[PDB]
């Protein structure tokens, strides 16, 4: 019962080369190089699923700091004032309000500043 490897080997290599579409040079063309580039891409993507949650909180905090300093407060006093006022609005939503609704963010700063 002799088994030829041609058809399965072909479809196996085509899966990897398909995942390597758009890569430079040998990285999208030749299997020995494509298979390393796909594995490294998956490794980076796994690490960056974690890191993106850090990067976006970084961004929200920056925008909230700018919004609060426009209203006369720093981030570390504004967040303390929210926690003292029992306001549960998350940083994602607070940054959205600071960016797209300046009067509402002014009202939130007023509440935090009255709490201090």
């Amino acid at each position: 019962a002799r088994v030829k490897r041609g058809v399965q080997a072909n479809r196996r290599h085509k899966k990897i080369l398909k995942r390597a579409k758009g890569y430079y040079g040998a990285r999208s063309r030749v299997y020995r190089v494509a298979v390393q580039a796909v594995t490294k891409a998956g490794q980076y993507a796994y690490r960056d699923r974690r890191n993106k949650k850090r990067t976006f909180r970084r961004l929200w905090i920056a925008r909230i700091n700018a919004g609060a300093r426009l209203n006369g407060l720093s981030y570390s006093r504004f967040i303390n004032g929210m926690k003292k006022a029992n306001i549960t609005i998350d940083r994602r939503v607070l940054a959205d309000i600071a960016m797209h609704d300046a009067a509402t963010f002014g009202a939130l700063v007023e509440k935090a500043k009255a709490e201090l």
Partner: protein, 142 residues
């Protein structure tokens, strides 16, 4: 709901004048660098230049504390063997006075293409006058 970026075409860059007369070099440079990067704006996105145009006058009258006028040294290498040159704060301010504040701010900016773009907005002039009255820059104490 998604967190949005500032969309470069929708960003406007405002013009401000800073009088450097008698201010501390590093303490003024931190504020200028923040303004150039756009950190005071609530649409701040790290990959978009949302900063302002800072025009600085009296750049030669910037101040340093301690003995830093005579003891702060600026080095450079020319690319040739033994080609390490050193100047002073005092001599640099005599020779090319805008270099002192330019160096302070350039070190405090991001070190990449967007950093190069955002230091273009720094306009330094030794003396009381600047040529940008057509841009109507507002006075910014900072």
């Amino acid at each position: 709901m998604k967190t949005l970026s500032a969309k470069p075409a929708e960003v406007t860059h405002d013009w401000f004048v800073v009088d450097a007369d008698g201010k501390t070099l590093g303490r003024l440079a931190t504020q200028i660098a923040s303004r150039l990067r756009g950190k005071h704006k609530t649409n701040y996105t790290p990959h978009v230049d949302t900063g302002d145009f800072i025009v600085v006058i009296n750049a030669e009258k910037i101040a340093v504390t301690g003995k830093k006028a005579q003891d702060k040294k600026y080095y450079r290498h020319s690319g040739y063997p033994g080609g390490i040159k050193e100047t002073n704060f005092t001599k640099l301010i005599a020779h090319k006075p805008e270099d002192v504040l330019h160096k302070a701010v350039k070190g405090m900016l991001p070190k990449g293409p967007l950093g190069y773009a955002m230091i273009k907005k720094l306009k330094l002039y030794a003396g009381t006058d600047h040529p940008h009255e057509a841009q109507q820059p507002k006075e910014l104490d900072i």
